[PDB]
Homo-oligomer: A and B are copies of this chain.
């Protein structure tokens, strides 16, 4: 069964700004999603120190970047803490409301889209490059879920029956037709080297 939800007005407004504003420095989306993965990995690693069985769903803590020219997707996979259904439907949205409002205020005052990550809503920078984002995620206390949104003010969530991921989050960027440079090996390597050089987890860029 697929459930369809309305984003809060403020988050929809943010997504439309990210989609509609002229802003050429789009490559920052990748830094933001890797940053999110690094935070999710810190969180599982911290929780494991007190409950080692939290890693029974997989010990390795890493980030993979997987381009696929045939599907026109760039996937960012981590083995971090994952997201529950409540995170997907409620918690992230309530955190995203006040971050959005601060970000909007900063932007009126001359801040730049590249600062989005300071307001805790850097995930939505995926819409610089993706016409659709699919997120597959699995938290230890919950089932594997697929969330998806092409913006336009709604998102879906369903229980995912695809390949079991163990634990973590996969963000699948369905790239806009003019953004396929982000499938290119040397372009991805360039961006990781520039913005993500000191991330404390191995980042493997897959080759096609």
Q: Chain A interface (Cβ within 8 Å of chain B)? A: 42, 45-46, 49-50, 86, 90-91, 94-95, 98-99, 102, 106, 111, 115, 118-120, 198, 200
Contacts and interface: CB of A to CB of B under 8 A. Distances in A.
Contacts of A111: 198
A49 B45 CA distance: 22
A120 to B, nearest CB: 7
A181 to B, nearest CB: 27
B94 A198 contact: no
A25 B99 CA distance: 30
A200 B42 CA distance: 21
Closest 6 CB pairs of A and B: A118-B198, A49-B91, A102-B200, A49-B94, A106-B198, A99-B200
Given A99-B200, A119-B198, 17 more contacts: A42-B120, A45-B95, A46-B91, A49-B91, A49-B94, A49-B95, A50-B86, A50-B91, A98-B200, A102-B198, A102-B200, A106-B198, A111-B198, A115-B198, A118-B198, A119-B200, A120-B200
Contacts of A42: 120
